[PDB]
């Protein structure tokens, strides 16, 4: 067992193993709040996630059980992964704060781009870590939703981990998302992907929405109205009828691309989800040629997910949360 120190954080006592040095805040919200810190024990920078009221609601047990399961299954080098996870507590009866420790890369996408034109190799290099990365993700059967420049953390090396920082944020929701469909097909993400990548390419964003509905227009203007086929999978004539108050040849946001960046994001931003290039067909695509390793572009082991179909008490959330705490062996 670490001896811990104790110090005042976003507004609260994080109580951390001496290990965890220079701990400055980064992000903060009611689900909890992180910190940049450094670890002298790895000698590695890392980002210190303190969950807020960890075990305050069934919501919030099973929301911390759900992270701390997701983090421990995440083994790819372009996923964020649970380097460390610490409680103070030294007994399930005393447990109370769930505190993750993850690699800190340093910079998140918008830092490196700063709303700037990359390069088509850079952009190569960029999207072909998000693809790898949620291969490997969508491989255990996990769906990000929330794929965004702010929740890519790249280092110096342009190094890439997807993570997810919730504790602009509408720009990169795949439309059946902000349309609360409930049936997520993985290319949710890929959507993100595409609107990234766009992005990245152009250095403006693809769907400046400035609200749910400004949103909606501005996808509905760039891929078209919806086809025969996917206006066959919408049940509601009135829902059609709203549509059709609104293709276009990707060529004149993406000007000057390289047409296999074109191809690629054409084949990503596809209303129908359903007919979007998946993470495995995309990191196959002549666009990522460079470095595209059919051998190197990991699966994850299939992961438990039953959980997430469970309406248990808090105290079994918490208790499977310490379970998953104290069997941690960092990597
Ligand atoms: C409820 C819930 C469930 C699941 C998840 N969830 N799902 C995932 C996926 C596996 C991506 C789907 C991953 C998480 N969780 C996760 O990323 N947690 C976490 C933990 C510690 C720190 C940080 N934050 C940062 C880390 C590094 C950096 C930055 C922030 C910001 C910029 C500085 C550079 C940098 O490098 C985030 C989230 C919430
Ligand atoms: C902008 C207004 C039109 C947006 C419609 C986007 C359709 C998204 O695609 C849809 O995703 C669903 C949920 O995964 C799937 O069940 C559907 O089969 C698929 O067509
Ligand atoms: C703003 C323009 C968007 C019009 C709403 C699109 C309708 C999508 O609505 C979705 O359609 C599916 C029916 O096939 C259902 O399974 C989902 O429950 C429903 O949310």
Known sequence: ?????????????????????????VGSGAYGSVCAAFDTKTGLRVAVKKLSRPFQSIIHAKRTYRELRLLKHMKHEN????????????????????????????????????????????????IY???????????????????????????????????????????????????????????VDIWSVGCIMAELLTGRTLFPGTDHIDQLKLILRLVGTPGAELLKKISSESARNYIQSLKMNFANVFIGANPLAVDLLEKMLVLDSDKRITAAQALAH??????????????????????????????????????????????
């Open 129 to 187: 870590q998000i693809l790898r990365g949620l291969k490997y993700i969508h491989s255990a059967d996990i769906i990000h939703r929330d794929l965004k420049p702010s929740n890519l953390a790249v280092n110096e090396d342009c190094e890439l981990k997807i993570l997810d920082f919730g504790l602009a944020t509408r720009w990169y929701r795949a439309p059946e998302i902000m349309l609360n469909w409930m049936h997520y097909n993985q290319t």
């Open 79 to 126: 996923v964020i992964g649970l380097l460390d996870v610490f409680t103070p507590a030294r007994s399930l009866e005393e447990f109370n704060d769930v505190y993750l420790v993850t690699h800190l890369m340093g910079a998140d996408l918008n830092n490196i781009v700063k709303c700037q034109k990359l390069t088509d190799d850079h952009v190569q290099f960029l």
């Open 1 to 25: 067992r670490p001896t811990f120190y104790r110090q005042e954080l976003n507004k609260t006592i994080w109580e951390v193993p001496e290990r965890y040095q220079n701990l400055s805040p």
């Open 286 to 331: 002549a666009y990522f040629a460079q470095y595209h390793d059919p051998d190197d572009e990991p699966v994850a082991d299939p992961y438990d997910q039953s959980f997430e179909s469970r309406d248990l008490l808090i105290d079994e959330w918490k208790s499977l949360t310490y379970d998953e705490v104290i069997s941690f062996v960092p990597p």
